[PDB]
Design a protein around this ligand. Sequence first.
Ligand SMILES: COc1ccc2c(n1)[C@@H](C(=O)N1CCC[C@H](C(N)=O)C1)CC2
Ligand SMILES: [Zn+2]
Length: 139
Amino acid sequence: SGAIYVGNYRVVNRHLATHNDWANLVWEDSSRDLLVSSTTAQGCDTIARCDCQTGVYYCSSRRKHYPVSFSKPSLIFVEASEYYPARYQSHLMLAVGHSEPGDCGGILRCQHGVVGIVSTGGNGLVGFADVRDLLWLDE
Ligand SMILES: COc1ccc2c(n1)[C@@H](C(=O)N1CCC[C@H](C(N)=O)C1)CC2
Ligand SMILES: [Zn+2]
């Protein structure tokens, strides 16, 4: 579990979104596993605007932060789940690191701020849904 709070927005994994997220829906993309809902309170999260390939992510299954090298956002095939059929997930970045179901929502950060959130994983690989291109989060 986990979300990004920037300005009047809440950024969560689409497959973990609540009824309130859908009642106050701003944008969603099933192909990215992203959903953005509106909030009343202000958000204090700086979103990175960069091409960084190194960062730090929070892994709640270990209650630890791990430094990682990660790939550029791309189309990667993701196996079937109770939320999605077998499809290519866009804007996804992989890293070598620990992840298990329950880690989705862990923020990935670089020196510039929030890069993305855990979305996939398995076999020593962790996948992150990129958010740096959503310039409308900051404006
Ligand atoms: C987060 O780490 C892991 C590790 C192992 C495993 C997972 N997640 C789970 C996972 O990746 N997905 C299920 C929920 C939706 C996901 C998506 N973005 O399409 C895919 C399946 C096993
Ligand atoms: Zn950055």
